[PDB]
Amino acid sequence: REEDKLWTVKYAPTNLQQVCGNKGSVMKLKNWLANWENSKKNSFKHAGKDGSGVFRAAMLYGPPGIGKTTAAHLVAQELGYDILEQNASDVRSKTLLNAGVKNALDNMSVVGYFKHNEEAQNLNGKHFVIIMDEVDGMSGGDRGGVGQLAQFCRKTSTPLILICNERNLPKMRPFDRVCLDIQFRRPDANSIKSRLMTIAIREKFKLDPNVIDRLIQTTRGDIRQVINLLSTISKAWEKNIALKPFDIAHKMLDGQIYSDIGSRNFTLNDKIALYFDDFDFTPLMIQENYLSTRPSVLKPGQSHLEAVAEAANCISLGDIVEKKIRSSEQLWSLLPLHAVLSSVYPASKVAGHMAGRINFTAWLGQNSKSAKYYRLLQEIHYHTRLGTSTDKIGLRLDYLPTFRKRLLDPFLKQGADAISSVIEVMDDYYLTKEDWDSIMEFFVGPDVTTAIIKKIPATVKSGFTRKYNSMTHPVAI
Amino acid sequence: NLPWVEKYRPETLDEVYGQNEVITTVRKFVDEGKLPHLLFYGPPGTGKTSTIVALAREIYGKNYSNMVLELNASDDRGIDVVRNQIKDFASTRQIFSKGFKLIILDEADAMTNAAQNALRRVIERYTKNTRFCVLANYAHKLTPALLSRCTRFRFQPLPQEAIERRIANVLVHEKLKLSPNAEKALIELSNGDMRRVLNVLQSCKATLDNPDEDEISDDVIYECCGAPRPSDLKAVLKSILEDDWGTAHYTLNKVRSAKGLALIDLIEGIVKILEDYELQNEETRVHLLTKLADIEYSISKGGNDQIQGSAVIGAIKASFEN
Amino acid sequence: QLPWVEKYRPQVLSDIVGNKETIDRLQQIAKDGNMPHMIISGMPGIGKTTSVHCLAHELLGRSYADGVLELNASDDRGIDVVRNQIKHFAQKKLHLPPGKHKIVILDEADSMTAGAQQALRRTMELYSNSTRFAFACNQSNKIIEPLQSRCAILRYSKLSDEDVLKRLLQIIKLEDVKYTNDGLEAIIFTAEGDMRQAINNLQSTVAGHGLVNADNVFKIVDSPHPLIVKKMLLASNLEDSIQILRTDLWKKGYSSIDIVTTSFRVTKNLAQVKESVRLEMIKEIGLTHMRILEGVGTYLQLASMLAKIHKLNN
Amino acid sequence: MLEAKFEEASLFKRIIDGFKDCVQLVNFQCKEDGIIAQAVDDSRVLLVSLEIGVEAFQEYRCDHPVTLGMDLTSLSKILRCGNNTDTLTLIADNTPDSIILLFEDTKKDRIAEYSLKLMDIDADFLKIEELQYDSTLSLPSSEFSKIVRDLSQLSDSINIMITKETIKFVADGDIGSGSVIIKPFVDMEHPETSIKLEMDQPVDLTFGAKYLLDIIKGSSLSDRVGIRLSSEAPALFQFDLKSGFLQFFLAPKF
Amino acid sequence: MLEAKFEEASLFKRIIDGFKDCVQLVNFQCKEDGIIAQAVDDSRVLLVSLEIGVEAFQEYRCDHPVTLGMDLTSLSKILRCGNNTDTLTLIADNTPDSIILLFEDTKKDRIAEYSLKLMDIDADFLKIEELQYDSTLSLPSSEFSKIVRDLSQLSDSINIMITKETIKFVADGDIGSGSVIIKPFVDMEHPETSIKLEMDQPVDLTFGAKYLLDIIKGSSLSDRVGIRLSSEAPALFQFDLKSGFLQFFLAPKFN
Numbered sequence A: 001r002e003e004d005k006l007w008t009v010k011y012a013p014t015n016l017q018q019v020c021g022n023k024g025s026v027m028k029l030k031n032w033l034a035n036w037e038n039s040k041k042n043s044f045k046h047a048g049k050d051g052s053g054v055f056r057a058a059m060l061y062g063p064p065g066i067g068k069t070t071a072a073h074l075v076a077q078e079l080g081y082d083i084l085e086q087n088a089s090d091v092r093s094k095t096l097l098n099a100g101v102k103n104a105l106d107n108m109s110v111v112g113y114f115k116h117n118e119e120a121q122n123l124n125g126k127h128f129v130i131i132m133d134e135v136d137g138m139s140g141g142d143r144g145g146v147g148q149l150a151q152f153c154r155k156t157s158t159p160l161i162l163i164c165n166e167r168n169l170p171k172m173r174p175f176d177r178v179c180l181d182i183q184f185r186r187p188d189a190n191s192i193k194s195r196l197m198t199i200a201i202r203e204k205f206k207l208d209p210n211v212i213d214r215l216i217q218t219t220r221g222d223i224r225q226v227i228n229l230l231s232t233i234s235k236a237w238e239k240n241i242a243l244k245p246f247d248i249a250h251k252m253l254d255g256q257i258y259s260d261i262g263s264r265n266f267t268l269n270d271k272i273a274l275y276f277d278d279f280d281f282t283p284l285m286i287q288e289n290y291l292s293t294r295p296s297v298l299k300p301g302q303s304h305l306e307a308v309a310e311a312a313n314c315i316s317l318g319d320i321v322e323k324k325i326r327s328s329e330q331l332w333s334l335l336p337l338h339a340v341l342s343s344v345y346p347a348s349k350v351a352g353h354m355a356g357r358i359n360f361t362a363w364l365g366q367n368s369k370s371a372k373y374y375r376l377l378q379e380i381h382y383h384t385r386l387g388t389s390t391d392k393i394g395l396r397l398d399y400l401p402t403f404r405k406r407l408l409d410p411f412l413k414q415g416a417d418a419i420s421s422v423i424e425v426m427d428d429y430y431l432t433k434e435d436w437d438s439i440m441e442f443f444v445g446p447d448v449t450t451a452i453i454k455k456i457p458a459t460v461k462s463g464f465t466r467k468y469n470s471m472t473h474p475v476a477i
Numbered sequence B: 001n002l003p004w005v006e007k008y009r010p011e012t013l014d015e016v017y018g019q020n021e022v023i024t025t026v027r028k029f030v031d032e033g034k035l036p037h038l039l040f041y042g043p044p045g046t047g048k049t050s051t052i053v054a055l056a057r058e059i060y061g062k063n064y065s066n067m068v069l070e071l072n073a074s075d076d077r078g079i080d081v082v083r084n085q086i087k088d089f090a091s092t093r094q095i096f097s098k099g100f101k102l103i104i105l106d107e108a109d110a111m112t113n114a115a116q117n118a119l120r121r122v123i124e125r126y127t128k129n130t131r132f133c134v135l136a137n138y139a140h141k142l143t144p145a146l147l148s149r150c151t152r153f154r155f156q157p158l159p160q161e162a163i164e165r166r167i168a169n170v171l172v173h174e175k176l177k178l179s180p181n182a183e184k185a186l187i188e189l190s191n192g193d194m195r196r197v198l199n200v201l202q203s204c205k206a207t208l209d210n211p212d213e214d215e216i217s218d219d220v221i222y223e224c225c226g227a228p229r230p231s232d233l234k235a236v237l238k239s240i241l242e243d244d245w246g247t248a249h250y251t252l253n254k255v256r257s258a259k260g261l262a263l264i265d266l267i268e269g270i271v272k273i274l275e276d277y278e279l280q281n282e283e284t285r286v287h288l289l290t291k292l293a294d295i296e297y298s299i300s301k302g303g304n305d306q307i308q309g310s311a312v313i314g315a316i317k318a319s320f321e322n
Numbered sequence C: 001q002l003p004w005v006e007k008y009r010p011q012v013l014s015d016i017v018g019n020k021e022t023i024d025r026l027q028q029i030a031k032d033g034n035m036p037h038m039i040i041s042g043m044p045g046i047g048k049t050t051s052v053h054c055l056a057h058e059l060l061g062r063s064y065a066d067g068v069l070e071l072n073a074s075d076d077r078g079i080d081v082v083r084n085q086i087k088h089f090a091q092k093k094l095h096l097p098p099g100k101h102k103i104v105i106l107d108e109a110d111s112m113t114a115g116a117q118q119a120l121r122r123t124m125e126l127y128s129n130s131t132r133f134a135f136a137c138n139q140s141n142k143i144i145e146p147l148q149s150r151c152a153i154l155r156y157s158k159l160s161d162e163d164v165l166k167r168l169l170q171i172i173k174l175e176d177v178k179y180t181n182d183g184l185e186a187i188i189f190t191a192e193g194d195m196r197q198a199i200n201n202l203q204s205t206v207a208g209h210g211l212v213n214a215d216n217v218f219k220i221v222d223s224p225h226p227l228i229v230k231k232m233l234l235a236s237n238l239e240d241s242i243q244i245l246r247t248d249l250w251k252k253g254y255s256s257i258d259i260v261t262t263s264f265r266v267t268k269n270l271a272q273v274k275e276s277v278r279l280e281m282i283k284e285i286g287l288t289h290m291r292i293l294e295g296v297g298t299y300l301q302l303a304s305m306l307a308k309i310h311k312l313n314n
Numbered sequence D: 001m002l003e004a005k006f007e008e009a010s011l012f013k014r015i016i017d018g019f020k021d022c023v024q025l026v027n028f029q030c031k032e033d034g035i036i037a038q039a040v041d042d043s044r045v046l047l048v049s050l051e052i053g054v055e056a057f058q059e060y061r062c063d064h065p066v067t068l069g070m071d072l073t074s075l076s077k078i079l080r081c082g083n084n085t086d087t088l089t090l091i092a093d094n095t096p097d098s099i100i101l102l103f104e105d106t107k108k109d110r111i112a113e114y115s116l117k118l119m120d121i122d123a124d125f126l127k128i129e130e131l132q133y134d135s136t137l138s139l140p141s142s143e144f145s146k147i148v149r150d151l152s153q154l155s156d157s158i159n160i161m162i163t164k165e166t167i168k169f170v171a172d173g174d175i176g177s178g179s180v181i182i183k184p185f186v187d188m189e190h191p192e193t194s195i196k197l198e199m200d201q202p203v204d205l206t207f208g209a210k211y212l213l214d215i216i217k218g219s220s221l222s223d224r225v226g227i228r229l230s231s232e233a234p235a236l237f238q239f240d241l242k243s244g245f246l247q248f249f250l251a252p253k254f
Numbered sequence E: 001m002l003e004a005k006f007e008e009a010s011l012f013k014r015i016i017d018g019f020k021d022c023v024q025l026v027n028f029q030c031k032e033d034g035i036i037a038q039a040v041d042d043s044r045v046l047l048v049s050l051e052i053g054v055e056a057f058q059e060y061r062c063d064h065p066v067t068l069g070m071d072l073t074s075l076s077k078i079l080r081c082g083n084n085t086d087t088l089t090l091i092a093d094n095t096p097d098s099i100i101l102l103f104e105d106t107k108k109d110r111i112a113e114y115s116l117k118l119m120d121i122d123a124d125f126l127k128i129e130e131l132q133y134d135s136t137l138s139l140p141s142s143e144f145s146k147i148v149r150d151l152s153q154l155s156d157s158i159n160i161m162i163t164k165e166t167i168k169f170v171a172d173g174d175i176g177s178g179s180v181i182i183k184p185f186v187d188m189e190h191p192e193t194s195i196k197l198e199m200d201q202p203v204d205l206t207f208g209a210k211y212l213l214d215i216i217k218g219s220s221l222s223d224r225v226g227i228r229l230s231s232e233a234p235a236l237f238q239f240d241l242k243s244g245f246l247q248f249f250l251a252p253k254f255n
């Protein structure tokens, strides 16, 4: 019907110009799917202008709810292909994969044939696009699924598109080089904001831009979560169901609450209940914005800095308590204590007036970035272990400063003829281009490389790519 | 040949000791016939299992082997157990009998949160046709819902009268001679645990049964049980309090090495002795208790034992200077 | 015999007391019909399962027996189940009013393994036209990220004291039992937000001692009396506190965990002392609690806790 | 002391294959009037009982009653090795610690001698309490087997009900529902295809599907099974025998 | 609404058992003419069409056209219940949320009524138009199933060649190869053993082994299966029925 559908399904994209964010990856996937036929004609050996001609299959990965499935379905439908979809809700064991999909690997569609075959629209209507979605979600009930799908990544005859959430997971190791792996990222705030404004204009109801920015900060970029939360719909809504952590942070940091007249009106039990209001976001919010308030509860002879120091000490104690709690859930009884140490005591110590605005916690984004970079470093070590004899931690600590002087330092001065030397160097360690970018990504400090990598001309980078796509020395087993 | 734990197990209600407060209400429940879901919790070696088995035997007599399901700990603890065995035992009826069936779980506190939720759902489902009686050692490791669904019963440790009556009873049916101080030491060590008493009595029996008539002195009981002697404890405390560092260190090392004692019971006995001293200043007690608790918590994680022993000596000598 | 918690369980959505904005949201949902997939998180015994049950009832009217699939912890929820049965139920044909939908209520969703939760993703995404999932979990952290992204999160706050007091007043009025105000205060103190536990303790008190009075409540709950704990914590001489802990609490066989929890819950309500001293005493009590939970529940730890509390109060 | 000769070999074969799955260990008590046995499943819902007198045998001789506790799995394994033309004989002597089975054909001297080990677990509780039942009926075992293994796929709880001259089996699950109605009738052409029924008061009660599937496995004994249903009492499923019977006591559900 | 009465209880059983291995969910379009039902494979390679005209029904009303979405596993579990001597009866009420299957015995009052919950399937009904197939032959289904079971044990691809009035099946596997040659001939003594052939252009096609093994299971409905092969169109296998037909559309492989 019209009003019975969800907001995520009714407002889902229809073309490729509505998918917000990650335009580069979508364009790369579309170009690869379009030129797949020419690459098949040449036996998958001549990488044409993008190094994406030798890859049989593609792999989509990234955070949850970015548009992976939508983008894949839309780029498959736009070129006139026929979609054969398999997901986690189907038994993708080794025997069942051999039975069902292996037979339909190279065959032609019957629905695609009987659908439209008389008008000269496109010759790829009968061909298959096999979309293996949720490949990371294969449980223990699918034996040999990863290996059989990695084998399917080769010796195939139709565009195979794999979708996962954590590519650098060691379980996904058999997909090392046999598939083109493009990466989806958390879309910029502007695109999500524009999509929200469009949806709100269509639904005929206005919001404050501050509320939109706060929602985008809360959901951490999951567009699906944003739409599903907006569907719940104004001050009462944001103040009681949606943005509750911000209200908790604002109420627990008030100076008038911990005064004697105020404490007798708002006793400790109300503050602990305020913590229990949301026992998953209050400690992080408090740790985020406890040292940005002008106090009014300082003792007669206590400066700001030592009060903040005591608050941080109690914060560390509460973090230890939280680790002890989450180590064993059956210790639920320790939740009240974690209320006082993590949330109530520092706020009490440094309560007062908010200097500026209350910001959402930044620990989640930094933790996700740290996990991603840890997995990237482990993947780099998996390749370079045979020639360094160093630990996965000492590598980043010692080797990479020299690798910068070896890999990119020639490019800034020698120009574009030193490509052979740097390829020779990076081939003594079984290093690839994605590994090169991952290496350059890590350089924090005065040696930041994100500004210089874009400064160099694009012709040099394209020449490097096309020259590297020719020669390869990746075998050591 | 059978262990005294099983041989001297109460077969009826009247053969349990020191639990009158719960026995009267259990008798009221059984003669009224309104037996609800029970939670028997308390320190180990008290009589929970014996009490519930005796109650089941009294209620069902010979058919006890038919309507009583005695389950135990993990035993390949999957959700399949609570989902199939208990569920079919509660849902299916009984043959050639009248009344409600009984399921008794031993040490049901080792269940995870999911298992406890499953069990409380099963209890809520068939609460009209069967009654659950669960045993536990600590009433805090259980979900509050499962605790509320039933009625609790705390089995307080056995006082002197009950354990002495049981010593008399075990002396009736056995040819044994026991010294007046031996029983005093036995009760001081038992802490109110009948199981450990029956464990140590037969061990000392088999130890000194040369003519079947020797007198069980306190030294052999202390050796079989591995508990510190008050004389050695007081001697170590006096040596730490009065003598110098070398002498006190040597005495502590020789006492804890020539007997086979761990620092835990050393600290326990030492603080138990220090509890009743006539201290002048209170900061002494404050520092003593705090530092010895810190030493205990550090010993709990297994450090270098000589360092913690020297720290015990230092704390004792530094707290008793005011 | 019949548990009062089951007999007086709310059946209409308006009878539920406590959270007001979320109950109003659920009322508007049941009045409109367009219900989305929803996770319901919160502390135990605050009305989560009852909420979704009355919601499904008011939504489907005379169709609850045909278009509602409930799976609690006592049922098999593996990979085979979520693949076969849930999918076959989502695809079932059913002629419902233009606003209503089918309902799959999964209780204790945090107990479902990750492998089983992975399979529900496309099942709940593709059939959003005739199936809406409702999860009821205690911890919203054991639910995988995709599920948390799909369905809206609804947190239930812990119950305050006036709401539980009003519910107990309604219960005792409809039950015609004698009571005293300090007994109700003891019930509120012991319940700490658990409406189910509050009703259970009230029924137990009424059935055991007849008159709801603080002494009978503290006798039947089998917990350290808050008065004696307050006297132990607020004593002047440390020797007095140690003697009280020795002869009154430790001798009667109370568990150290119970002693520490009662001290925590009494120090929280000690409105005579200041706020900073209360917070620091709670900090020391929590340190002792964490020490005990690590395997050492020795009397020495409680003695050291009392010593630290006395040194702080001095 | 104990000598029992069978007229054929497949008789004991089907006798043991009747209740192989419901119970593992069983105690045969042999007395001058024949062999009796009773056992219960581990779930304590279904009780199997078997009685066989001195008429189906050929030569039976015993002085005093004796008990032999054995595992049905091993006895079935050793019994499977016998043909259909042999004459199985069981012999036991004083202090019985091993039962001795002998197959032998009169035209072919094939001495098949086998010894087994005996168990010792014994819990008897023999009781027959209600001689009057609210509803009784007798029907061919083939039709009842077809019905029970036809309605077993739809659910796990089969609801039987005896109304006025209308036997009704109901099943309700997730894939649909099933209702089988059968009415009594006496056939003069063949007595083994008749439906006999006697109803004192209407009855209706449920049963587990797996327990019925286990009970029905003893359909190779006879060609007509008798069902006796009565509320607040265990239902009786009896397969007759030339010199005895095998009957299952089942408990209803809620 | 509708009320259909089959002559025998085994007809619908064999019908459902013919294609219960390649299709899981199916739509049944009940019109005044009879029952028509098409379903695509899970891999979207083997389409199944089934037509049962009014002549196969003893009684059939079907006041207005309707659609019944149902599974094949539960239907096969239910249809297995009835014995041989029963009169299967399909019933569906107005706005049907389920379907009733009655089994009535002719000489006794033993009535067995079952219910089945209908599934919801999107009607992606695609139309089939008569194409002039190059090769149009027919052979007894027994020998065809024999050749399929013979060749499928060697490789995973069966190649069919029609050229110069000769049928040629071949398979190239890892353990070896296999080939079978068939010449058309007529037998006046037994018309049920006669390979027809109407050749227009030499055709060469390649199909999977699993799909052929699934198709040959329908050899219990009829005895002579017809085959229509084209150079660029999906092959058509046809089993005729006393009042209808069962058609398998199978798509060839690539070069």
Ligand SMILES: Nc1ncnc2c1ncn2[C@@H]1O[C@H](COP(=O)(O)OP(=O)(O)OP(O)(O)=S)[C@@H](O)[C@H]1O
Binding pocket: A007, A008, A009, A011, A012, A013, A018, A019, A020, A021, A063, A064, A065, A066, A067, A068, A069, A070, A071, A165, A195, A223, A224, A227, C146
């Ligand atoms: N770029 C986007 N613009 C607008 N809506 C989007 C966008 N990406 C996702 N959505 C919404 O999210 C819904 C489903 O997103 P999906 O792309 O299917 O999620 P996903 O990328 O597959 O991540 P998983 O599979 O759940 S881990 C769509 O129906 C849209 O409503």
Ligand SMILES: Nc1ncnc2c1ncn2[C@@H]1O[C@H](COP(=O)(O)OP(=O)(O)OP(O)(O)=S)[C@@H](O)[C@H]1O
Binding pocket: B004, B005, B006, B007, B008, B009, B010, B015, B016, B017, B018, B019, B043, B044, B045, B046, B047, B048, B049, B050, B051, B107, B166, B194, B195, B198
């Ligand atoms: N009250 C008692 N009266 C007499 N004997 C007792 C008593 N309590 C324990 N015993 C003895 O100790 C043995 C063990 O008793 P149990 O009831 O099994 O212990 P429990 O108190 O139930 O707790 P457990 O078994 O350690 S989990 C019994 O077999 C008796 O021999």
Ligand SMILES: Nc1ncnc2c1ncn2[C@@H]1O[C@H](COP(=O)(O)OP(=O)(O)OP(O)(O)=S)[C@@H](O)[C@H]1O
Binding pocket: B145, C005, C006, C008, C009, C010, C015, C016, C017, C018, C043, C044, C045, C046, C047, C048, C049, C050, C051, C138, C167, C195, C196, C199
């Ligand atoms: N707000 C409320 N108003 C009235 N009664 C309530 C309320 N909340 C809980 N109750 C009572 O508590 C009983 C149990 O509540 P449930 O919702 O079943 O507990 P829960 O929310 O599911 O938490 P669990 O199951 O322990 S994790 C209900 O049957 C009611 O009698």
Ligand SMILES: [Mg+2]
Binding pocket: A068, A069, A133
């Ligand atoms: Mg997806």
Ligand SMILES: [Mg+2]
Binding pocket: B047, B048, B049, B050
């Ligand atoms: Mg015990």
Ligand SMILES: [Mg+2]
Binding pocket: C048, C049, C107, C108, C136
């Ligand atoms: Mg619940």
